[PDB]
């Protein structure tokens, strides 16, 4: 579950210690540290490439990092798009069952994801966005009831509400920060957790 390094990579890493190279260690290395658990192959392979390229051209990583930050706006949009896309496919994650209450939960779940997916488009007018915070609060309060009208299930209730809280937290920071990207990513996690609830009443 842990990367291995070749003799040559070991040798590179030792040869490459000038200050200009520190972003290799400060930024990429923790990246590879987290990647490691998810994708051992990828982590190792990419670490190898960075190490070599950096040895051979001290400065290279920093150039790459600074270029990526220069494309913040592209990522901002993509992330908007992801959030927008998230509210779709009502059919799949929903409860298959056509009932009076089980179909009613789907309806209350589809509602919330929808408000949430629209954030990138309301976040600019403080008035509309303010309204949307409210509408979201409803959708949440209204939804969590529809759950208690109908123990790993407990864990989802906990997680949902935890991610529910986190979204508020991130919200509070945006009015102190102007960094919408934190809001989107956040909203988008809540949508996912909403999907996870309905997964347990599918199993």
């Amino acid at each position: 579950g842990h990367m291995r390094m070749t003799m040559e990579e070991m040798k590179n890493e030792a040869e490459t210690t000038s200050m200009v190279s520190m972003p290799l260690y400060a930024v990429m290395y923790p990246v590879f540290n987290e990647l490691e658990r998810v994708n051992l192959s990828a982590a190792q392979t990419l670490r190898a490439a960075f190490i070599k390229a950096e040895k051979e051209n001290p400065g290279l990583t920093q150039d790459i990092i600074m270029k990526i930050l220069e494309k913040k706006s592209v990522e901002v949009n993509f992330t908007e798009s992801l959030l927008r896309m998230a509210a779709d496919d009502v059919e799949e994650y929903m409860i298959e069952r056509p009932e009076p209450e089980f179909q009613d939960l789907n309806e209350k779940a589809r509602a919330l994801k929808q408000i949430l997916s629209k954030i990138p488009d309301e976040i600019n007018d403080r008035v509309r966005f303010l309204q949307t915070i409210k509408d979201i609060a409803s959708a949440i309060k209204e939804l969590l009831d529809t759950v208690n009208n109908v123990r790993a299930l407990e864990h989802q209730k906990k997680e949902f509400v935890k991610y529910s809280k986190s979204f508020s937290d991130t919200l509070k920071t945006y009015f102190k920060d102007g960094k919408a990207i934190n809001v989107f990513v956040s909203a988008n996690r809540l949508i996912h957790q909403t999907n996870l609830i309905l997964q347990t009443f599918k199993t």
Binding site: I133, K134, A137, I140, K141, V161, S164, K165, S168, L171
Partner: peptide
Amino acid sequence: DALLADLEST
């Protein structure tokens, strides 16, 4: 519910 009403007021 405490958190919920709090967020709502936020």
